[PDB]
Design a protein around this nucleic acid. Structure first.
Lengths: 86, 122, 53, 113, 138
RNA sequence: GCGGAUUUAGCUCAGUUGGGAGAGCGCCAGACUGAAGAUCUGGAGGUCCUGUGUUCGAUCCACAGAAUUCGCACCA
RNA sequence: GCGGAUUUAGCUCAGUUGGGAGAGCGCCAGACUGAAGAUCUGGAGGUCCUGUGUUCGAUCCACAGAAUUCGCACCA
RNA sequence: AAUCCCCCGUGCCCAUAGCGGCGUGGAACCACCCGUUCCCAUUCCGAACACGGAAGUGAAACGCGCCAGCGCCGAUGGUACUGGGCGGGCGACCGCCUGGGAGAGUAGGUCGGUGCGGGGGAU
RNA sequence: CGCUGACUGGGGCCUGUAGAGCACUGAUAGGGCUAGGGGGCCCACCAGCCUACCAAACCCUGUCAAACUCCGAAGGGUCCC
RNA sequence: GUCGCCUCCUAAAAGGUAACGGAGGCGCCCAAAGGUCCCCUCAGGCGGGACGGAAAUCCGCCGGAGAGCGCAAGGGUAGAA
């Protein structure tokens, strides 16, 4: 009443990462960028990454959310010109 | 500038360490800068397999302190030769060393522009 | 939960009476009859809190 | 490493700690010889030479007082601008007795910290 | 292009078993060599061999150099029958990317080695191209 | 070609904190005896299968491979 | 984990007046032997499971865990 | 007090600012420096953190400049790969027609460029 | 409900196979420099000596990778016009 | 043989897909890897000395962090977890 060996055979299961909302769309106080949950969002867009430059999301409200390192936590604000006096 | 390269102390240790409690207390009384570090490994060349024990003793002592020691401790040592190692520095005895201090030494301490200490200054 | 007399043992802690309790998982592993910390029972707020049960 | 991970000593990031928010970076840059602080506030902000050891000469009261004043005043200069509650800036070293000094400044300076 | 399970889980990290590279002799100019055009998980063995027989017929100076080498492999019959096929390895080589720098018969005037390699092509398997290099062959 | 187990000082075998290794019967020296032998007296001795991996360190924990003994290869 | 059974020397166990810590061996030694064994002599044997409490005094009485063991309790 | 030269706090552009070779600066600046009772302080000493202060010094960190050796950047013409369209070979595959067109590979480029404030330095 | 839809033009922001590349990693070949084992020589506790066989690592000439990539397109995506 | 769930590769570059296709981990745990406030700068290599001749212990240099993070991988990333 056990299990065997020499049959590696070991399928893998599912995930579901994304950039949801990609860069520069109607910004809604909701899941910003994703690739590491428990995540700790940030302020506006993010531009820090194992790449160099940065990314703007011409979309501004409360905040977004990170992914733990990847992408690059937000902080470089960027409400967007669409955040002035009505 | 002969007012440069021309020396001015710089560190100088003097320690010991056995695969062990207190022996360093005989260390405290001879100076005043207790060394508390942990040697290790994992074999039987002495019964020192224990790879995570507190046996390493090292009573750091540059400038000021070392002076009192270089002093009251420099008489009972009989040699003065060979024991002279490259990197302007040297180690004799139950465990003791002291490093030179040409003018181009420090810089090797910077987190930045860490000039790998040229070999014409040291 | 999965009651496993394996250093894995579930317990709580009163509020000096603040009245009832609050959730907690544990491990004899170390400190046996050891278990204290404060909270706030329906009883006002705060209150010392032993855990033993 | 990235520029700030091979050198050593700083903590700039423990500056960015307060960066998040709270107010002006009542950042206090020190150099014994004297003390100099600005007011980096969010948005590519700026500053208003709120207090410096030279601005009004470097006196002759050493550490103590210096601060005691440089701050106060500083605090004085600003609250004229239109600030109010500014966040502190340990700029560097540990709120040493200097530091703490200047600090006083602000506080006494009425610029809440 | 079916290839293997990984470089250390199925079968990856070997010597592939063969007979090293260089032979013949130097030579600054004289460009004497061989390459192909055919694509084929070059039959290791067949490979190893071949080239070798090459030396077998010559001996010394003629860059018996040779720029090949397999490093992955197939698999088949082992276990039940035909269905859910696990895997039993055997026969590694390397893709002869539709032609390329094969081995070199490189040296001043030593065709006594050109013919050789020649004998070397004859062998081989996937046809082969008989050729010269920058300058030709002297 | 599939599943279980085993490959330790000549031979049969023991060891799940793994961290430090034996048991009985061989083999050489000393006694008993005119003599061998049985029998009392001490010692010499091993890749715990080949090659690797986790680990501070394991042969006892794990993954392949050769050699070993046993089962399975049945329905038309 | 619901209940009962106990807690002592290396092993197996006595120990009821609340005041001596005991027996057997088994184990070690002495005597004896050519030696060992068998017999006789002798000796040791200690966290009385731990803690706290009761008491002039605790192996013993009281209070949790504890551990071992047997039976039982099973629709998450 | 609303112009340039300099040093100092210091920010953006994540090496065309790094390495290192030589050099220069201390009136001003800045550090090193001079001491250690009290603030605080080293698992060991006030080396680092630290309080008070002249002389001494530019050696060192440091700032501007010169040096291509290591690095970093990096075109044009160019070849692979290919979105789309259609032909050859049983064959693994080959080719054409149309827009996309890298890395490496020589040129060469680099020894930062630029914000705000503070001290001066230019009646 | 009524121009929002497949599709195209524009504009950002992404993915990073194919390819290519070797500084991350793991192969792997020709070789140079070298110390580990040799190996022959003073007999060899000598740890002094030369050198034709195997090597580790660094250096030059080279090369393979789906579970390698300092590099990087074909293209697809998504919000807006 | 195998069914759950965690990762890689497969997915052709948004997301996502079989194969009894590849390889590998989990049904723990840690009361202090918890919360913050305060300090630290890795592996390694080289050079110099006790007990030390692999392999420490200290002292002086070199360092896109290759160490570091209880556990498998992969992302991360010292500014630091």
């Amino acid at each position: 009443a056990h299990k065997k060996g020499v049959g590696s055979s070991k399928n893998g299961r599912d995930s579901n990462p994304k950039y949801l909302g990609v860069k520069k769309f109607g910004g809604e106080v909701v899941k910003a960028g994703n690739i590491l949950v428990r995540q700790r969002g940030t302020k506006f867009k993010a531009g820090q990454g194992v790449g160099m430059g940065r990314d703007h999301t011409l979309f501004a409200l409360s905040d977004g959310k990170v992914v733990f390192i990847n992408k690059g936590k937000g902080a470089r604000f960027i409400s967007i010109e669409a955040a002035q006096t009505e | 500038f002969h007012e440069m390269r021309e020396p001015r102390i710089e560190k100088v240790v003097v320690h010991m360490g056995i695969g062990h409690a207190n022996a360093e207390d005989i260390l405290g009384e001879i100076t005043g800068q207790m060394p508390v570090r942990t040697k290790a490994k994992r074999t039987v060349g002495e019964f020192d397999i224990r790879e995570g024990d507190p046996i390493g003793a090292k009573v750091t002592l540059r400038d000021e302190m070392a002076e009192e020691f270089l002093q009251t401790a420099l008489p009972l040592a009989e040699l003065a030769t060979s024991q002279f190692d490259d990197t302007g520095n040297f180690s004799f005895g139950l465990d003791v060393t002291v490093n030179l201090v040409r003018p181009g030494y420090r810089v090797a301490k910077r987190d930045k522009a860490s000039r790998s200490i040229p070999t014409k200054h040291r | 939960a999965k009651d496993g007399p394996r250093i894995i043992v579930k317990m709580e802690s009163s509020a000096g009476t603040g009245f009832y309790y609050t959730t907690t998982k544990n491990r004899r592993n170390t400190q046996a009859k050891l278990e204290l910390k404060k909270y706030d029972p329906v009883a006002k707020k705060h209150v010392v809190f032993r855990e033993k049960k | 490493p990235m520029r700030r991970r091979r050198e050593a000593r700083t903590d700039y990031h423990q500056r960015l700690r307060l960066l998040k928010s709270g107010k002006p970076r009542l950042v206090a840059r020190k150099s014994n010889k004297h003390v100099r602080a600005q007011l980096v506030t969010p948005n590519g902000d700026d500053t208003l030479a709120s207090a410096h050891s030279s601005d009004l000469a470097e006196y002759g009261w050493e550490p103590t007082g210096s601060a005691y004043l440089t701050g106060l005043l500083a605090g004085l200069r600003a609250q004229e601008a239109g600030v109010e509650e500014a966040v502190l800036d340990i700029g560097l070293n540990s709120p040493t007795p200097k530091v703490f000094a200047i600090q006083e400044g602000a506080i006494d300076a009425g610029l809440d910290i | 292009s079916i290839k293997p399970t990984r470089r250390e889980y199925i079968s990856g990290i070997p010597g592939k078993g063969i007979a090293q590279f260089k032979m013949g002799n130097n030579t600054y100019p004289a460009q004497v060599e061989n390459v192909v055009e055919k694509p084929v998980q070059i039959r290791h063995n067949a490979l190893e061999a071949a080239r070798n027989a090459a030396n077998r017929f010559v001996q010394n100076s003629g860059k018996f150099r040779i720029r090949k080498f397999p490093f992955h492999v197939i698999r088949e019959q082992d276990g039940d029958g035909m269905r859910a096929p696990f895997g039993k390895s055997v026969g590694t080589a390397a893709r002869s990317h539709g032609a390329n720098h094969d081995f070199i018969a490189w040296v001043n005037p030593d065709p006594a080695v050109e013919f050789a390699w020649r004998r070397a092509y004859m062998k081989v398997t996937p046809t082969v191209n008989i050729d010269s290099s920058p300058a030709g062959n002297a």
